[PDB]
């Protein structure tokens, strides 16, 4: 059986409770955050707070597909968040396409596919993003990029494929929305590739279980939580917002 | 805030429900298991079903401390479970002492200690057990040992250090009891070392949160689940047991 | 006066000298090239090395005429070189017909025609291919197509119309042959259209001056340079070739 | 290899030959010019004919740094050449600081720096000054300013950075001296910024290659060419000059 987990709605409630109680934690940049530690929930919605920007997600998907570890290869103008985190040559660590499709990271996609193709019940169907050398690699050439995704395991039960996503650190507003788009993409891909290998498999995408060490909102997005707490709306324009989180 | 997780007592209940409903899954050895996928609970007891064998746990601790990748170096008679999984030269992968203390695995314990000593609020305080090359390493020289522990992250909040344990696969009866004893040991050690570096820290051991891709019971231990379901006792002698799981 | 420039024969000689001296530069694909920087010569021959394929050039002319930015609209089977450089929807940037005849690129042909029709001596008769936004456009939707032609200026002196072609990057073997066919076409067109406006003009096509930032040969075509260096023949079948550039 | 180009001394010779032969072309103002079409030379001197006025060049540098498209913002008294070419509100197009540093022109300097910092061997390292809409923009609000510089490309070879400057039109006497001072400034800046990003790069300024569609001298400066032809002096006072170009 799949575990009886929280949903995104209940995560929203706990994040609102945390802000209500001023349970703040100081980020490495010096700014405040609210936070749930050891979060586990079914990702039954594609975002938590904020708006869906399918345009950005598609540019990031194309970058993942290229497997490039240089932020300039992100289609179009590179987001400043990617610029500030990059090395002195424009390099990073956290291209998730490189992580699962590069032979440099030991063919994570292909090996998980072969595993599950040979034994559908396997507990060893897993894609390993992070690496032991990350202790030293995260600030190579002055980058600041310690891999936030650790592992994603895939379990086929009742002809549905469930993903168990293990993250170290996930921003609620931008992080989860982008990362979920990615994990949903890869799950759909895996289902396709297994079904294409044998037409009697008839697998379907199951649940994505999201496990996060520190799931947090930054102070600049507190107004989103505050507004939802008052009104029940998961998004406002920063201009239309009124309340103490200015 | 720390998430509102299940406790061991609730995990027992769900496993008892899975057996009651005959929710069986076939293991790679061909034997049946019951199973919870994407389990997440606070490890608030040192075992789930069965009895505590402090003698064995101490021998396995001594083996971890040696950092030896050979099963003959387990003090005394090497258990058969370790023999059947070892390579042709008696080698394995899953010595957790090697994983956190060897320089070959990039000094996991020391680097996580240095991180947390420099920034107590860090989300980057983590010990990475598994590795990308595990896709190929798990059956080197004919061993069968795919690393079950992925990562353990440590978060200091309110002067308590919480451990978030991410496992791929965990046997409920033997695995959890031994693995919990290990993770408790390391958490206590980390607290001590951080406190020894500065006497004003005054950190204390917090919660151990257990995240398991597949948390399962093998058919040979079904009689334990069944007996608990009927009586509420978490252990019987296999000889004293009466019921249909013989 | 028109400047005393190199000819194609002298370009051949310098390219042979570069290969002789192993003056190699590593392409972005990881492969080797020889190269002349800041090349300037009169294009007094329709190719440098290799053979003329009038069949391909005509298919590319028809695509230019359609002004389509999708590579599938190239008549017949699309060359793989155009496929690998295209976006995820089959789109590119470098349709030169779009560049000079589209109203989206500000009517370059028509405006240059009007300029030269009004003042034959003008220094402002120019067709601008590239654009400032090319810094961001070159990898839109995952294409890899940074416009190689910058500008072509047209100067009418002594009743002859001279073209000054400014390119960023030009492949010696395929690039120059195709691109020259195009630039010769447009020059002949411009002469026709100006003569048709006034029968007393009697303009004639003059010289095409080719200016290239990086004029290069890829390693897979080194055998052409090598063979010419030994024999003086500007083409061999790859099968008939014998020498160290296999 | 860098192409074997003419030097400034040879350009002087060809201009002296053109005047000797009365190879005149009528300017748009109705005045005569001598002219070299498709000129390409290494700028190995900071001027061709005339005298260096470091005072004026510094004022024009300060104007470029402000990025202002209004000629009144040139420090001190705005030169009449800039007044007669400006629009009804004093606006122009050809502030080169605006061209390379404004976000309105798509961040030319920064993007070329990011390209070359990521791949030193790149052929895509370029600053695009002009734009397709210049066909309409050159006489906006009655200005007369059609961008004279098209593109400048930068190529790093043998740890030297070579600039390839592509101009549509360049006055030999005032234009080249001012424009060269500008391009030298930017090349030195780019070297500094690349070296500051990584101390092992150790790049040095290479050659500036000057490519001009129409390189010309106006009739009011013919006395300079004539005097040099006779004596070899690259400058005279107009009062001290004696000869038929009065
Ligand atoms: N795909 C990603 C990459 C990064 N992060 C966020 C999580 C943290 O807010 C920050 C990483 O910081 P740290 O390394 O300090 O956790 O980036 C994320 O949510 N998802
Ligand atoms: N420290 C460990 C090592 C192994 N296992 C158990 C979990 C599975 O029952 C088995 C590994 O099998 P698989 O690799 O098929 O998951 O070993 C465990 O519980 N804890
Ligand atoms: N009409 C074209 C289009 C492209 N290229 C060649 C020049 C380079 O070999 C490559 C472009 O690569 P880069 O953008 O890296 O210069 O394509 C060319 O010669 N002519
Ligand atoms: N930075 C600049 C700007 C302009 N010009 C000169 C070249 C021509 O003499 C004139 C522009 O005229 P046209 O647009 O007719 O070429 O200005 C120049 O030399 N350099």
Nearest Cα residue to atom 4 of ligand 4: D148
Report the separation in Å between the CA atom of C173 and the middle of ligand 3, taken as the mean of its atom positions.
Answer: 11
CA distance C76 to chain D (A): 31
User: How far out from the chain centre does Cα B154 lie?
Assistant: 15
Spatial CB neighbours of C174, under 8 Å, sequence gap ≥ 6: C50, C81
- The active-site residue, picked from C148, C161, C167, C194, is C148
Is D148 an active-site residue? yes
| Residue D186: strand, helix, or coil | helix
Please, are residues C38 and D40 in contact by the beta-carbon 8 Å criterion?
yes
Region of B159 please: left (phi>0), alpha (psi -120 to 50) or beta. Answer: left
The span from the CA of D127 to the CA of A20, in Å, is 52
Please, are residues D131 and C101 in contact by the beta-carbon 8 Å criterion?
no
Q: How many CB atoms lie within 10 A of CB C50?
A: 16
* Structure-token pair, residue C147: 């416009």
Give me Rg for the CA atoms of chain D. Answer: 19
Query: Taking CB atoms and an 8 Å limit, are C142 and A66 in contact across chains?
Result: yes
The span from the CA of D152 to the CA of D169, in Å, is 14
Question: In a mutational test of the pocket of ligand 2, which residue from B26, B96, B169, B178 has the highest number of ligand atoms less than 8 Å from its CB?
Answer: B169
Residues lining ligand 2, judged by CB closer than 6 Å?
A 123-124; B 28, 94, 146, 148, 169-171, 175, 179
What is the 8-class DSSP label of residue D166? E
What is the 8-class DSSP label of residue C243? S
The span from the CA of D137 to the CA of A245, in Å, is 46
Report the separation in Å between the CA atom of C79 and the middle of ligand 3, taken as the mean of its atom positions.
Answer: 15
The span from the CA of D225 to the CA of D45, in Å, is 16
All chains having 3 or more CB pairs closer than 8 angstroms to chain A: B, C, D
Instruction: State chain B's maximal CA–CA distance in angstroms.
Output: 58
| Residue D40: strand, helix, or coil | strand
Q: What are phi and psi of C238, to 5 degrees?
A: -60, -25
| Residue C145: strand, helix, or coil | coil
**Which contiguous run of DSSP H or E holds residue D153?**
strand D149-157
Q: Exposed, middle or buried by CB within 10 Å (0-12, 13-18, 19+), for C150?
A: buried
Alpha-carbon dihedral angle through residues B214, B218, B222, B224, given to the nearest 10 degrees:
-80
A94 touches chain B (CB under 8 A): no
Among A215, A214, A219, A237, residue whose Cα is nearest residue A227: A237
A62 touches chain C (CB under 8 A): yes
User: How far out from the chain centre does Cα D232 lie?
Assistant: 24
Please, are residues C13 and C20 in contact by the beta-carbon 8 Å criterion?
no
User: How far out from the chain centre does Cα D153 lie?
Assistant: 14
Residue D138 alpha carbon, nearest atom of ligand 4: 14
Among C221, C198, C194, residue whose Cα is nearest residue C206: C194
Q: How distant, in Å, are the alpha carbons of A80, A209, D228 from that of A196?
A: 40, 25, 80
The CA-to-CA distance between both ends of chain C, in Å, stands at 45
What's the sign of the alpha-carbon dihedral D175, D176, D182, D187? Answer: positive
Report the separation in Å between the CA atom of C246 and the middle of ligand 3, taken as the mean of its atom positions.
Answer: 24
A70 touches chain D (CB under 8 A): yes
Domain range D1-246, its CATH number among 3.40.640.10, 3.30.572.10, 2.130.10.10, 3.30.565.10: 3.30.572.10
* Structure-token pair, residue A133: 């050398």
Q: How many CB atoms lie within 10 A of CB B16?
A: 17
Interface test with B, best of A12, A23, A135, A187 (most B CBs within 10 A): A135
- The stretches of chain C forming alpha helices (DSSP H) are 8-20, 54-66, 80-84, 96-101, 108-118, 134-137, 175-197, 222-231
- Chain A hits for C139, Cβ within 8 Å: 73, 75-76
Instruction: Report the residue from A2, A111, A128 with minimal CB separation from B37.
Output: A2
The span from the CA of D189 to the CA of D113, in Å, is 10
What is the 8-class DSSP label of residue C30? S
The span from the CA of A90 to the CA of B98, in Å, is 35
- DSSP β-bridge partners for residue A157: A160
The span from the CA of D2 to the CA of D40, in Å, is 13
Among D184, D181, D183, D176, residue whose Cα is nearest residue D212: D176
Instruction: State chain A's maximal CA–CA distance in angstroms.
Output: 58
Please, are residues B216 and B172 in contact by the beta-carbon 8 Å criterion?
yes
- Chain A hits for B126, Cβ within 8 Å: 150, 168, 213
Instruction: Report the residue from C3, C39, C112 with minimal CB separation from D39.
Output: C3
- Chain A hits for D197, Cβ within 8 Å: 88-89
| H, E, C per residue of chain B | CECCCEEHHHHHHHHHHHHHCCCCEECCCCCEEEEEEEEEEECCCCCCCCCCCHHHHHHHHHHHHHCCCEHHHCCCCCCHHHHCCCCCCCECCCCHHHHHHCCCCCCHHHHHHHHHHHCCCCCCCEEECCCCCHHHHCCHHHCCCCCCEEEEEEEEECCEEEEEEEEEEEECCCHHHHHHHHHHHHHHHHHHHHHHHCCCCCCEEEEEEEEEEEEEEEHHHHHHHHHHHHHCCCCCCCCCCCCCCC
The span from the CA of D174 to the CA of D182, in Å, is 13
Residue with tokens 């099968």: C239
| Residue D101: strand, helix, or coil | helix
Among A126, A133, A214, residue whose Cα is nearest residue A168: A214
Please, are residues D172 and D15 in contact by the beta-carbon 8 Å criterion?
yes
Residue with tokens 């976000």: D103
Among A113, A198, A101, A152, residue whose Cα is nearest residue B150: A152
Q: How distant, in Å, are the alpha carbons of C2, C152, C203, D144 from that of C192?
A: 22, 18, 8, 29
The span from the CA of D239 to the CA of B60, in Å, is 102
Interface test with C, best of A60, A72, A75, A79 (most C CBs within 10 A): A75
| Residue D169: strand, helix, or coil | strand
User: How far out from the chain centre does Cα B65 lie?
Assistant: 16
Among C28, C144, D213, residue whose Cα is nearest residue A66: C144
For A68, how many CA atoms within 13 A lie in the half-sphere containing its CB? Answer: 20
The span from the CA of A146 to the CA of C75, in Å, is 49
- The stretches of chain D forming alpha helices (DSSP H) are 8-20, 54-66, 80-83, 96-101, 108-118, 134-137, 175-197, 222-231
What's the sign of the alpha-carbon dihedral C219, C220, C224, C226? Answer: positive
Nearest Cα residue to atom 9 of ligand 4: D171
Report the separation in Å between the CA atom of B77 and the middle of ligand 2, taken as the mean of its atom positions.
Answer: 21
What is the 8-class DSSP label of residue A240? T
Nearest Cα residue to atom 7 of ligand 3: C170
Residue with tokens 């370790």: B82
Region of C158 please: left (phi>0), alpha (psi -120 to 50) or beta. Answer: left
- Chain A hits for B105, Cβ within 8 Å: 132
In angstroms, what is the resolution?
A: 2.2
Among D175, D153, D173, D156, residue whose Cα is nearest residue D165: D153
The DSSP bridge pattern shows strands B126-128 and B149-157 to be antiparallel
C29 touches chain A (CB under 8 A): no
The span from the CA of D28 to the CA of D40, in Å, is 24
The span from the CA of D26 to the CA of C126, in Å, is 19
Experimental method: X-ray
Give me Rg for the CA atoms of chain B. Answer: 19
CA distance B39 to chain A (A): 6
Question: In a mutational test of the pocket of ligand 4, which residue from D30, D143, D146, D148 has the highest number of ligand atoms less than 8 Å from its CB?
Answer: D148
| Residue A235: strand, helix, or coil | coil
- The active-site residue, picked from A148, A161, A181, A187, is A148
Q: How distant, in Å, are the alpha carbons of C205, D11, D48, D209, D212 from that of D43?
A: 30, 10, 9, 6, 12
Among B186, B163, B228, residue whose Cα is nearest residue B14: B228
The DSSP bridge pattern shows strands D160-171 and D204-218 to be parallel
The span from the CA of D101 to the CA of D107, in Å, is 6
Q: Please spell the DSSP secondary structure of A15-32, one letter per residue.
A: HHHHHHTT--EE-TTS-E
Please, are residues B228 and B234 in contact by the beta-carbon 8 Å criterion?
yes
Region of A194 please: left (phi>0), alpha (psi -120 to 50) or beta. Answer: alpha
Neighbour-count burial for A39-69, b at 16+ CB within 10 Å, e otherwise: bbbbbebebbbbeeeeebbebbbbbbebbbb
* Structure-token pair, residue B61: 């601790």
Please, are residues D154 and D128 in contact by the beta-carbon 8 Å criterion?
no
User: How far out from the chain centre does Cα B118 lie?
Assistant: 28
* Structure-token pair, residue C167: 């390119």
Q: How distant, in Å, are the alpha carbons of A213, B135, C228, D240 from that of B165?
A: 9, 21, 67, 91
Region of D243 please: left (phi>0), alpha (psi -120 to 50) or beta. Answer: left
Question: CA angle, C215 as apex, C209 and C219 as ends, to 5°?
Answer: 145
The CA-to-CA distance between both ends of chain D, in Å, stands at 45
Query: Taking CB atoms and an 8 Å limit, are C155 and D211 in contact across chains?
Result: no
CA distance D211 to chain C (A): 8
The span from the CA of D234 to the CA of D224, in Å, is 7
- The active-site residue, picked from D34, D148, D224, D236, is D148
Q: How many CB atoms lie within 10 A of CB D4?
A: 11
- Chain D hits for C102, Cβ within 8 Å: none
C141 touches chain A (CB under 8 A): yes
Query: Taking CB atoms and an 8 Å limit, are D118 and A88 in contact across chains?
Result: no
Among D210, D217, D169, D166, residue whose Cα is nearest residue D17: D217
Spatial CB neighbours of A176, under 8 Å, sequence gap ≥ 6: A43, A47, A48, A170, A210, A215
| Residue D235: strand, helix, or coil | coil
Q: Please spell the DSSP secondary structure of C101-143, one letter per residue.
A: H-GGGT-HHHHHHHHHHH-TT-S--EEE---TTHHHHTTGGG-
Report the separation in Å between the CA atom of B94 and the middle of ligand 2, taken as the mean of its atom positions.
Answer: 10
Residue with tokens 């993250």: A167
Query: Taking CB atoms and an 8 Å limit, are D28 and C134 in contact across chains?
Result: no
Report the separation in Å between the CA atom of A226 and the middle of ligand 1, taken as the mean of its atom positions.
Answer: 22
Residues 150..179 of A with a Cβ closer than 8 Å to C: which?
A: none
The span from the CA of A67 to the CA of B24, in Å, is 40
Helix axes D222-231, D8-20, angle to 10 degrees: 110
Spatial CB neighbours of D88, under 8 Å, sequence gap ≥ 6: D141, D142
- Chain A hits for D117, Cβ within 8 Å: 88-90
Nearest Cα residue to atom 9 of ligand 3: C171
* Structure-token pair, residue C27: 């392409």
The span from the CA of C8 to the CA of B126, in Å, is 63
The span from the CA of B128 to the CA of B150, in Å, is 6
In chain D, whose CA is at the least distance from the CA of C138?
Answer: D124
Helix axes D108-118, D175-197, angle to 10 degrees: 50
Q: How many CB atoms lie within 10 A of CB A210?
A: 27
**Which contiguous run of DSSP H or E holds residue A59?**
helix A54-66
- Chain C hits for A65, Cβ within 8 Å: 142
Question: In a mutational test of the pocket of ligand 2, which residue from B30, B33, B175, B221 has the highest number of ligand atoms less than 8 Å from its CB?
Answer: B175
Q: How distant, in Å, are the alpha carbons of A22, B50, C191, D132, D134 from that of C112?
A: 67, 89, 12, 12, 11
The span from the CA of C147 to the CA of C131, in Å, is 9
Query: Taking CB atoms and an 8 Å limit, are B38 and A107 in contact across chains?
Result: no
| Residue D176: strand, helix, or coil | helix
Residue with tokens 């009689």: B223
User: How far out from the chain centre does Cα C118 lie?
Assistant: 28
CA distance B205 to chain A (A): 15
CA distance A148 to chain C (A): 25
User: How far out from the chain centre does Cα C70 lie?
Assistant: 20
| Residue A7: strand, helix, or coil | coil
Per DSSP, chain C holds a count of helices (H) and strands (E) of 8, 6
Nearest Cα residue to atom 15 of ligand 3: D123
- DSSP β-bridge partners for residue A204: A160
The span from the CA of B44 to the CA of D197, in Å, is 52
């Amino acid at each position: 059986m799949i575990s009886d987990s929280m949903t995104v709605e209940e995560i929203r409630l706990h994040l609102g409770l945390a802000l209500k109680e001023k349970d703040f934690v100081v980020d490495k940049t010096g700014v405040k955050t609210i936070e749930i530690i050891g979060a586990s929930f079914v990702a039954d919605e594609p975002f938590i707070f904020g708006a869906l920007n399918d345009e950005y997600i598609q540019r990031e998907l194309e970058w993942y597909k290229s497997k490039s570890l240089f932020v300039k290869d992100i289609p179009g103008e590179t987001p400043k968040i990617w610029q500030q985190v990059a090395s002195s040559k424009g390099e990073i660590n956290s291209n998730y396409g490189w992580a699962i499709w590069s032979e440099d990271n030991y063919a994570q996609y292909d090996m998980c596919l072969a595993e599950l193709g040979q034994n559908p019940d396997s507990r060893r169907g897993i894609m390993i993003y992070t690496r032991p050398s990350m202790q030293f690699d995260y600030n190579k050439d002055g980058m600041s990029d310690f891999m936030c995704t650790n592992t994603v395991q895939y379990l086929i039960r009742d002809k549905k494929i469930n993903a168990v996503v293990n993250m170290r650190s996930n921003d609620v507003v931008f992080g989860f929305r982008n990362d979920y788009a990615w994990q949903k993409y890869v799950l759909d891909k895996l289902v396709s590739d297994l079904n294409a290998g044998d037409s009697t498999r008839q697998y379907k995408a199951g649940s994505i279980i999201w496990n996060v060490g520190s799931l947090h909102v930054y102070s600049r997005h507190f107004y989103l939580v505050d507004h939802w707490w008052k009104t029940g709306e998961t998004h406002i324009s920063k201009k239309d917002y009124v309340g103490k989180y200015a």
